[PDB]
């Protein structure tokens, strides 16, 4: 039968997906979802996403599940950088700004936000880390302002690690900004609290 937890709330996802401001990639914003109901069919079926890729789950099976926890990580990247937000990937974002574990369960959702994020003179409030001494471990946030080297000296050199991007209406697609939300799941060995819309009985 269907015998799910006695949940009395709908999940507060509007705050995750329909926000006016998104975090920069090096300082991505994590939120936890718990003790609520969500219908994933609706979001999945919407045609607005350019990317909707799941790891370990299939979108069509999401409503039959209930999770220990759901974490939503949101941020802005360029369109050509979408490739890097995946397990197994490398590159300046995968390595210096937002690292996923390679063993990953959850869904990566993304859409074009040129209409909200690009500004006529360039939206320079969005910054990316170009310089780091080593790669990140999964789910780290490098929000430091330390300065990087060039030649073999202490601190030509002294590079500020972050670079703003010219998100401007003039950009071709690869340079348009994209909003990315990653839903990371915890499940199975647990008193799960985030459930789909099922008709619990007996």
């Amino acid at each position, epitope marked *: 039968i269907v015998r799910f937890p006695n*949940i*009395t*709330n*709908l*999940c*507060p*996802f*509007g*705050e995750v*997906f*329909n*926000a*006016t401001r998104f975090a920069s990639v090096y300082a991505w914003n994590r939120k936890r979802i718990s003790n609520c*109901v*969500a*219908d994933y069919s*609706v*979001l999945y079926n919407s045609a607005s996403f350019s990317t909707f890729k799941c790891y370990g789950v299939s979108p069509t099976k999401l409503n039959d599940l209930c999770f220990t926890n759901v974490y939503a990580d949101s941020f802005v990247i360029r369109g050509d950088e979408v490739r890097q937000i995946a397990p197994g990937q490398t590159g300046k974002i995968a390595d210096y700004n937002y690292k996923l574990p390679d063993d990953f369960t959850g869904c990566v959702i993304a859409w074009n936000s040129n209409n909200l994020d690009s500004k006529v003179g360039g939206n320079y409030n969005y910054l990316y880390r170009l310089f780091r001494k080593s790669n990140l471990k999964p789910f780290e946030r490098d929000i430091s302002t330390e300065i990087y080297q060039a030649g073999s000296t202490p601190c030509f050199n002294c590079y500020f690690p972050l670079q703003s991007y010219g998100f401007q209406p003039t950009n071709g697609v690869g340079y348009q900004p994209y909003r990315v939300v990653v839903l990371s799941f915890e499940l199975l060995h647990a008193p799960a609290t985030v459930c789909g*819309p099922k008709k619990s009985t007996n």
Partner: antibody
Amino acid sequence: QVQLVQSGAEVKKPGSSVKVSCKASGGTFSSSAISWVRQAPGQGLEWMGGIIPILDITNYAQKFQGRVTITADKSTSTAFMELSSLRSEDTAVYYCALRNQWDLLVYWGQGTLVTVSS
Amino acid sequence: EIVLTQSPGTLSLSPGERATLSCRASQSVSSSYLAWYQQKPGQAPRLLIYGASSRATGIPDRFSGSGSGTDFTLTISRLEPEDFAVYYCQHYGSSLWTFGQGTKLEIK
């Protein structure tokens, strides 16, 4: 694509009852909450209560506990509010409003005046 | 409970100038649940701002919302002749909605 559609009304005597329907369209009836809001002539807006059809949870504003029943029927994507034992202080415009999860935007219907008089 | 209070109750403004409306909550709220609306006599409320800042579709960029905690505001950059209306703030969290009286923005 969400739209809320409401019916018209008239009541001929206090003590009677009005039941107002709100038809939702645009899909996503499920995973949304439906609220009822009243606007008496010369006044601002007040919330009466609301329902979440898939949890089947109804929450009433305290001043309206008693007289007010809020229900829903998802099979026809609609919702209802009924106010019994009318006292003519309530000859207000009644609005339905909806909000979906996965969003922040609030959709409103066309409020309907319920006039109660001899 | 969550009580919104608006100020000033009334305004007297020139068409063409800038003006703002203040909304103050009794207790702090998430900005994600604040909205601003306007009415013309005989009309249903028109949504202007949602999530305390996003502009609703069809609303001209004269209207700009902002705020946090208990203190929120709506700014109208020019007060065009069509902008003279009753305005109000709403908190729309899931457990209880509250509407803030309203302010009348008059021309004179």
